[PDB]
RNA sequence: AGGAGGUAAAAAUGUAAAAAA
RNA sequence: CGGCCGCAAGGUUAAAACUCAAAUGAAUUGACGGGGGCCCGCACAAGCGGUGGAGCAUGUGGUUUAAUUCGAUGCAACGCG
RNA sequence: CCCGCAGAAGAAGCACCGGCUAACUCCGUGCCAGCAGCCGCGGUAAUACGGAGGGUGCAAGCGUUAAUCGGAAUUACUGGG
RNA sequence: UAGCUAGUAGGUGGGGUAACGGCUCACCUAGGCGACGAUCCCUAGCUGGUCUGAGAGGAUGACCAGCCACACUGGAACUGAGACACGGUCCAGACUCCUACGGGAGGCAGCAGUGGGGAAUAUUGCACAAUGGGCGCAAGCCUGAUGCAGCCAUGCCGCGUG
């Protein structure tokens, strides 16, 4: 954790100062705020769609021994 | 048909497949029972069965089925595994015998006491 | 009654707005 | 995948892991067809007069409130009970 | 092995009861939680879930898992396409 | 898995063993094995039988018997009627024990038992009374062979809980 950043391409030292200043700000912010959690979600159409199968299926499965 | 085709190429018997791939002829095996979770079955039904992955003693990460309601496992506490499937979980082949070596038989269970580790109230 | 040519055109899906966790 | 043939495109030979409790054939009855034929109805065409435009009456949704009672809510709810 | 005492005292469970397959009702939960070998059961009356009571099977054994064979004439020589 | 093999295929002669033989050398011939499946790879002790099945087959080979093979790992002999040897010897290695550091010692896949692995599988029991073997003139001596018990509902068979 002894961070070492190299500001090279710019003949002026003070131009390399702000080049290093740009490298400072972006490096830390990308590591600051992470991903958004708290997934997943509860089903929506299960209350209906899944029951749709149960309304048409049960009418057929009543065999009545042969 | 065609005996001469039969005398060159014998009647090959199809290989009978087993359904408990733990190990050949092993009834029950001990399992570490790591990382327990709870998910949902498929299309016809809907529930939240307590199921877990099991790191076996022969390095097999098999997926099992935690039975009953009152569990006692989490990341450790080695238990026992028996075969069988429940068909609702798309991909399970193993069961769990409640009243295991490190999992107690559930209380407030009066009937169906052969399994589920139910001790008969002697009093 | 056989026959011979002849006359015809673009347009999807079924939580279908009702959710977020 | 390996072998072989191939300029190459590939071909030939030929598995398993895993997975569902099915997949499938022919025929039958309906239903449907931007398939065909026959036939009917204000279906259209031929016109008449309206709605939708304005006001008002009245019912519903929504919204709001302490309550706006419940129910009916494609055709077949909405001057409905 | 034989003889004596012998208070019934010291001795009954487990599975299953939707069909497959002998065997039923009520309460509690409301596709949530669970059951299941196969199809499947459960959306506030569940004979299939949990429990209670009643029923049946087997018995000092009882069910589950595993392995083989049978059923599988679904490797067919007997005996298939 | 398509070619496999070079004392390898056979010949001759000597060597060699209880016994014929490339079992082994010298020299000659150039063969022999191969789709009726050789070499090569995986797996496995084999059989009388066991389980099931109408039968034919299918699976299997725990328990009893016959045979083969192994003894911590590899190799090699010797004594002898016979081993190329479980509880003998020589050598190397791996792993333990003893140590005066010089140098030695050891082998439970024998009966029990300990740890361990595993789903799981028993006492550190008693005795040679019977049977079998070994040795001995016999008497006898030894035997965890064998004979029984301990433990287990593990299966079978049987009575009981009136």
Swiss-Prot record, chain A:
Residues 33-66 are annotated as: Disordered. Belongs to the prokaryotic/mitochondrial release factor family. The chain holds residues 68 to 133 of 140 of the full protein. This is Peptidyl-tRNA hydrolase ArfB. Associated with 70S ribosomes and polysomes. It is found in: Cytoplasm. The unstructured C-terminal region is required for ribosome binding and peptidyl-tRNA hydrolase activity. The C-terminal tail functions as a sensor to discriminate between stalled and actively translating ribosomes by binding in the mRNA entry channel downstream of the A site between the head and shoulder of the 30S subunit. This allows the N-terminal globular domain to sample different conformations, so that its conserved GGQ motif is optimally positioned in the peptidyltransferase center (PTC) to catalyze the hydrolysis of peptidyl-tRNA. Rescues stalled ribosomes. Can hydrolyze peptidyl-tRNA on ribosomes stalled by both non-stop mRNAs and mRNAs that contain rare codon clusters or ribosomes stalled in the middle of mRNA. First identified as a complementary ribosome rescue system when the stalled ribosome cannot be rescued by the SsrA(tmRNA)-SmpB quality control system or the alternative ribosome-rescue factor A (arfA).
UniProtKB/Swiss-Prot annotation, chain B:
InterPro entries: NA-bd_OB-fold (IPR012340), Ribosomal_uS12 (IPR006032), Ribosomal_uS12_bac (IPR005679). Keywords: Acetylation, Antibiotic resistance, Methylation, Ribonucleoprotein, Ribosomal protein, RNA-binding, rRNA-binding, tRNA-binding. The modification 3-methylthioaspartic acid is found at residue 88. One of its GO terms (cellular component) is cytoplasm. Changing residue 42 to R: Confers streptomycin resistance but not hyperaccurate translation. Pfam families: Ribosom_S12_S23. The modification N6-acetyllysine is found at residue 107. Disulfide bonds: none annotated. It comes from the Bacteria. GO terms for biological process: cytoplasmic translation; Group I intron splicing; maintenance of translational fidelity; positive regulation of RNA splicing; response to antibiotic; RNA folding; translation. GO terms for molecular function: misfolded RNA binding; rRNA binding; structural constituent of ribosome; tRNA binding. Part of the 30S ribosomal subunit. Contacts proteins S8 and S17. Interacts with ArfA. May interact with IF1 in the 30S initiation complex. With S4 and S5 plays an important role in translational accuracy. At least 19 substitutions or deletions in 11 codons can promote streptomycin resistance, dependence or pseudodependence; all but one of the streptomycin resistant mutations (K42R) are associated with hyperaccurate translation and thus reduced translational efficiency. The streptomycin sensitive allele is dominant to resistant alleles. Belongs to the universal ribosomal protein uS12 family. This is Small ribosomal subunit protein uS12. It comes from Escherichia coli (strain K12). The gene is rpsL.
